[PDB]
Amino acid sequence: SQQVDKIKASYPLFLDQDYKDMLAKKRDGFEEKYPQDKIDEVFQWTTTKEYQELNFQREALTVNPAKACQPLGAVLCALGFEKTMPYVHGSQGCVAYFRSYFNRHFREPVSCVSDSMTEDAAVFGGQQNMKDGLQNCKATYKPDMIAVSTTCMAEVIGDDLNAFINNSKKEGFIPDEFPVPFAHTPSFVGSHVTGWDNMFEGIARYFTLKSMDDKVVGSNKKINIVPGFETYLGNFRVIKRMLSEMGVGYSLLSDPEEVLDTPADGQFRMYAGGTTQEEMKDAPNALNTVLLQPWHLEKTKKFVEGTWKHEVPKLNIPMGLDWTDEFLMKVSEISGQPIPASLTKERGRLVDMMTDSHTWLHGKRFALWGDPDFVMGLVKFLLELGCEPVHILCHNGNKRWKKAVDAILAASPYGKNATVYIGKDLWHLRSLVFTDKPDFMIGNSYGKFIQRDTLHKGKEFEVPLIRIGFPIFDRHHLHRSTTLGYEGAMQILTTLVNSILERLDEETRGMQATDYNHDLVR
Amino acid sequence: SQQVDKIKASYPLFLDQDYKDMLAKKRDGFEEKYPQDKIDEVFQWTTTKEYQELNFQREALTVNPAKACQPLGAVLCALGFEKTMPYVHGSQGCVAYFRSYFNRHFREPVSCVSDSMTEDAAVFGGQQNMKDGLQNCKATYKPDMIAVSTTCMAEVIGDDLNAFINNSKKEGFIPDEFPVPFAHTPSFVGSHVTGWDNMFEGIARYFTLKSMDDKVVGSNKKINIVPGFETYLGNFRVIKRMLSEMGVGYSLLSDPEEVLDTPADGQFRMYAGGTTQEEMKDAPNALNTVLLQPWHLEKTKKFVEGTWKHEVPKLNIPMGLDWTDEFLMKVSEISGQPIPASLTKERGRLVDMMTDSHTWLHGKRFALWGDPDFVMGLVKFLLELGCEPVHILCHNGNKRWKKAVDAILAASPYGKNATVYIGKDLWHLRSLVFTDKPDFMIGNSYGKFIQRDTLHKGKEFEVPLIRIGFPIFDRHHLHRSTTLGYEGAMQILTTLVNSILERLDEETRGMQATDYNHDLVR
Amino acid sequence: MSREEVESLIQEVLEVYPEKARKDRNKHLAVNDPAVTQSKKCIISNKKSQPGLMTIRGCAYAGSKGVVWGPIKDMIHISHGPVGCGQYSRAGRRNYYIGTTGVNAFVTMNFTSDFQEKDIVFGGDKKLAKLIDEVETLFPLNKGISVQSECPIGLIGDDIESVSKVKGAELSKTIVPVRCEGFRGVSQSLGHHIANDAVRDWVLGKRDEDTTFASTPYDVAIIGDYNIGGDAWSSRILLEEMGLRCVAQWSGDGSISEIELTPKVKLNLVHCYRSMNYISRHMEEKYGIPWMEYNFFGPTKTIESLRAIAAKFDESIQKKCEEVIAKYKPEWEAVVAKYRPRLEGKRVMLYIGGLRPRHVIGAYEDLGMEVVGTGYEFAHNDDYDRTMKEMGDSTLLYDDVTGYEFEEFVKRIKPDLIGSGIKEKFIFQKMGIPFREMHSWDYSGPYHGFDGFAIFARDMDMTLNNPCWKKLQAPWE
Amino acid sequence: MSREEVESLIQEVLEVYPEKARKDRNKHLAVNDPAVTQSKKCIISNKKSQPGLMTIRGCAYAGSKGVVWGPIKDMIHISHGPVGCGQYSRAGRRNYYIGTTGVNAFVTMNFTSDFQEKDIVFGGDKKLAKLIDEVETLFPLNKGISVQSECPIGLIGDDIESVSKVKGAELSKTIVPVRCEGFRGVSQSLGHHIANDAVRDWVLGKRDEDTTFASTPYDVAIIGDYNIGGDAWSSRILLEEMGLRCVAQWSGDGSISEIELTPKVKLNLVHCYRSMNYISRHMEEKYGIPWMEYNFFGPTKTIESLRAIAAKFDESIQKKCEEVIAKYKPEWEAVVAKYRPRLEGKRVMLYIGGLRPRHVIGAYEDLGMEVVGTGYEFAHNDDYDRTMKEMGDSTLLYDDVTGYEFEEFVKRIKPDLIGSGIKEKFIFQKMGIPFREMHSWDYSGPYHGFDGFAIFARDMDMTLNNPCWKKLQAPWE
């Protein structure tokens, strides 16, 4: 039943007695459900160290991964170029998922096409889909460029992308001079960040590989910036903002801010902003190229060093105090521009916030996960804050990356309880937060089910989730935030200390029980 | 007892059994405490409509006010002027409190002196304190200006500030040219916002009243901006940013952002930034003067209109979509500068966030309090979001302001359930959130004790607090936020919708009970 | 618009296409004529998507794992292949259930074999067998395993059916091999069919020789309700208030035991015809069980369905049917009184999957709204046969609409509200057109039944009449 | 530094002042000689603050309402006058209590008569009478009312004593008038004395002819512990582990009945000498109850106090004292073992109110730290008499230090750590100097007793050694 002036949705509608009674009858009548005592017994077992040992012996089963597949990253990279349509050669189910996954994180339209390879293409290859698809895409959505990646179908059957695209031009499906860069993006290699690297390197090759003879390093007086797989709009913006405050001429290569943040003014804009084709063609004339997330830009780095002849600086992701400092100092060194008083003051304001909040942050224990560069920058900043990374998980990390993070931990007394996990998933992480409980998790929305599990054991075992990363689906507009530079460090610091204080307030809200410590001033 | 490797502070130390037993013995032995059943009985009574009726019949008792006293605002206003020392003629206990109260909100030094009037001044007056205080202050802290306000002792005994200052100068305690503007700021009139108005009008009079003959309205082609009592750094910053973005020449009169946000770089800066003396002397040559918080700037308005002859535009506080629109359109009309494409796009990004989040905001019910301009702007924006302000409380509001908010409410179907309360306090509001429960409170840190009370009745009665206003003492760095302009509206929107979604997650976290609605995507 | 004007709109939109795509898309767009019984004379469907045109369709794995199998709560479903598919589909569909997740129920978890290159080159059958052992150890209360094949499985020649037969025999466990690779078929639809055939072949017959279930003449199954936001629960409550016993729910909040009990029911009540008619026809043929289509969207259709269902039983069920109708009459009449004046005359375009584009029309009409265009991602012509009589004369129909087409149709027709999916939502909000998700219900619902109609009405009003839609143009433009 | 270097520092800092202020401030600054017993020959105190020099002191209302009366948990304390005083002092001080706030306890609430101009013009005695009736109706479980006068009360000539007696007789209720107006005295100190006299005159004698209380030979009262972060509780547990019975706590977590029972105890244990010696002397003279000073900061002082307190009772209490010392010995030794190596040799400057600038020295020394400068806002010369022996030779002493002086002293001495108040904290952090709040305990504590020592040590380490202090210089500077 409903009362028309206080309508109930699913929660709390189904807590009404008649719905409760009906669901008990369904269970008892027809579900042949395990007894609740057995369910409790098994749940408790899944919180034990014995279960963790079996859990960590998995060799074939993955449960709740913390990574996605290559063409997702290819599509995000392609979106950063002016009037460019991401095009995934292969089966259309993939593109529905890529679009929906980004739709839910950015709350924006996400334009991407498929060429809808079916059983016929499974037998004969996908050449006809490529010729018709490129012609249909260009006629209908009028992009200035189509950037081609692949689904795993096209990879397994071995479609020759280069031949297919060349034949599309030779047979007149698209004009010979129409730009169609491509990359193979096999989902069974690496992860979504690998797909970003592969797609960028393909676009860079397309516009520069055969035109290097007239290039001269440093002749356009700019610095190239390659952001990598980046899902916070504030991170594109803070980099542009800082470089512009120093008067540093730059070229951001793959820039999807505008198309991921169009205004609601009565018009749908399929394309907006983005790196221009001329910016890519001219990028070898830069002074140098800075990779913002180097641990998934290895293929791009090889091309920029080997063909453009840029002496790519050895820089970490600019997260936290030290690494933002190093980023600005290196940019100052390459460009000749001094670090202006405005950024020096901004830096001191971050340090001020650190002095203000250090007593609440000291010794707090975190479990965290995400992509390799993001995770290592978060680990570094937590150490600067006097916090203790305890469980550091990077499902798509590698052994060299783990060696680098272990060295960062070893250099700080706040890393003494930290372990770095690569190749492990969020079902592994769930055991860790039961057997070696931290204070908080820092992660994406999939962490909410870990928090739910820990609370089921009891309030004193609950590990609350702090949402930083990708994807974030169950909160609105956090994709607008920043995690890089001084600005991103201030936002992370504010979120962390206020998460601590919100949780303390919850624990001290009980009147005449715990509210002796429910202080007005903290 | 303590375990050296896991040291417990008061919470949870005093939950140890030996502490519990000791406190039980203390209570039963010596406290002659009411029985718990009687305590439960009286608590339940304080949640009833019967109690609320008695509560609202109060004429003499105030409980948990939501306002402070005049000199607090005078100090904040004085802090906005270059190398200016706020000086409060009267009792030193006041200045200790003013400094501490701003210390805890901004987490910054707050410089302010007293002249330490003691009991002898009740008979003999405070002139000697003014003579020595002005000389000591100038010599010791080297301000370029001393801005004088009063404590309630000095008001009751009737100290003649003008004569005291003139005698100090005539007798050589301070140079005759040294700027000493003053204002009477009686704590028993109005509230802290009244003190801001009084102090600003005194400074404005000091630099312009006797020099009007050479002034020409519009001759300096700028617009004056008077912010009023403002405790978010982002609010000073967003007005300056939007005006610069338009190319509008302006003068912010009382600008404390720098001195309330100095960097931690190894040196303490007692003064930083601030409106210059030349800017106040030149202010009558502006095209016009805009008042950001007009409902506590009435004395300033009369001076600017009657003496500077500026036709102060009838503008609401620039909060929410409509009133930010009106502000930019009026600045454009006065200055002749068009609204640039960047601001138009920013506006459309706020509208986009509104369309993205409208389904979770719709119909949500709020109790809220604060200063009059802040409160009406929050009411206005809530209506624009499809939210229902239900309990609107302004302890320091007046009947004309109430009439204006009632007219705003009557113009929107979302105002049909709203009542505006003036002269009522947070013990009044506590009754209202029991007898007519909203979804959330929007208020300052004093609201946490109302949330504590509502949870005590039951989890289904808990009204969570969303911290927006002043003072905020129990979270860190929220004073860096913004509530004005499109930027402020984006921040408030994000906090409101994510507060709704955080609470829904808490309510649906119960496994096999409510987590059927614990959605990954919202 | 006149039928001629709608036809000119179709032709003008088609002008952008190359002639091959143009000739094809013309066959999938039509002006409705409600007198037509054979929709194939007006529109064709269930064909390949033309390449590069930005179809909204998914794949057979979506139809099998995401739609039919995924909701079954006490089995573990393996997304078998590389990591992408199971990650994008993890908890994206609101197929609600009661259980202890990770312990006896597993719906919102993502189990996968996370194929790497070694598995592509050498085959994944050995990995799948090891994976099954690890599932059994770490999730001992699972009541069966399904293997949802992603694209590479068939392409590399893996034999998941023999792994399933061998491991299932070894462990005395039900292990269902599903060959739902995304390259199969042309859409989610073939995934439905593959999934019903897997239920048929591996699960449904398990109790064929078991007579221990005491049936009654009032035993029914709810077929094709995936319990989006609780939809099936607010349907089940009415059927049991009317005196029927709902033995099974396929597959929202569904258990493997109630699937195995379904051949014991007396009547299969089919809500989603598209996805479940296959197994409904199978049970008619094998067990003699009749099936009938019904509609619980809005009061008019719900009341008609309750009476149609009750007429198959006896006078006692018909008496309870009329009592249920009498109980809820003041409730939905109050919903109509509040919200119909707010929605009277407003015009909606729909684009959804295989059932809702026709099946919610009555609920809109109960609030005085008009559905001026509708269409489906993957319906067949028997779906369009059922649609044309439900839509008004000279309304627009679109099968497997392209993004370009849908945007252009919307710009000409200018509806007051669009009901579609997540890939469409943010496009049309930016044009200033109120939008409601008609897959996920925009994280609201249920919408089925009388209790769902209240929520549906509230939702269409809060969005269509929201103050935000009057604010998109800056006052200085 | 040497004695001459400190003397030269003092004279250089004084050079900024006009002659009148210079001559005065010179008397309030000294180089310590631990052999001094007559501190008045080297430092004077409890004098007016020089105008305009940014003293850190508060007022007599803070000393009475904020310090002594406000913590009494089951009474309602009216801030009587305008709205400021009670608002700035609401829940600023962490005088912790157990109760149900708003129902039987009221500590963190702000009750005020919120004077407006008509109250100044006509007087507030009528308003006060009506306020009392409203308090009784709306908070019927209060066990007494105090009236804390703010500046205007005596300046306009109101008669709150008459209101208190008349309304008190009318209502059979204890209503205490306190004349703690901020213009009285020079600081928080006189507020203490006024508050003591108000306790003496209106509360303390109520049970003089009541013999129903069951005494024991081991009854004591904790006098002058305001339970900051639970300080009094972690003191009380030790005294009762030593076989004593703590009848009362003045006034942290204190009840009005405890206070009225205090004339029944055998010994008054005075921790804050400054604020409560007055009532302690009264109770000895009137009731024959002796009193003694003690110190629970750090293990050395706590062990010494427990032994000195036990020596006042029989051998059985002395035996339990050594058992208490034996129990906690491994606990505080683990604290020293962990934290003293992290803090050995570090130098601290302190500036606090009237007790802790000397009481916490032993605790710092228990961690190997050296207190190189200390001073008080409002101590008297009997406080400084007690300080000389506690401080090293040639250390710096400052009474009612000005903001300028404290900054200049810190710049020259360069301490590793500063312990002071909220108005000082953010100045010195910007200079790069670790700072600990030694009033509010920086939202931590307790610091009293053995359990408090562990927290104190952890807190000094976490701040002095925090990685943030090595980051204030940008690397390009």
Ligand code: ICS
């Ligand atoms: S199953 Fe089908 S697309 Fe019948 S695949 Fe799809 S939960 Fe749609 S129109 Mo999403 S044939 Fe169900 C459907 Fe309808 S996932 Fe849901 S809303 S009634």
Ligand code: ICS
């Ligand atoms: S009462 Fe006094 S200023 Fe003895 S007014 Fe002050 S809670 Fe200080 S040095 Mo705040 S004489 Fe207590 C004090 Fe000491 S408020 Fe606390 S810390 S031991």
Ligand SMILES: [Ca+2]
């Ligand atoms: Ca959006």
Ligand SMILES: [Ca+2]
């Ligand atoms: Ca600060």
Ligand SMILES: [Mo]
């Ligand atoms: Mo057609």
Ligand SMILES: [Mo]
């Ligand atoms: Mo089978």
Ligand SMILES: [Mo]
């Ligand atoms: Mo049928």
Ligand SMILES: [Mo]
């Ligand atoms: Mo001295």
Ligand SMILES: [Mo]
């Ligand atoms: Mo008295």
Ligand SMILES: [Mo]
């Ligand atoms: Mo004594």
Ligand SMILES: [S]
């Ligand atoms: S989950």
Ligand SMILES: [S]
């Ligand atoms: S409170």
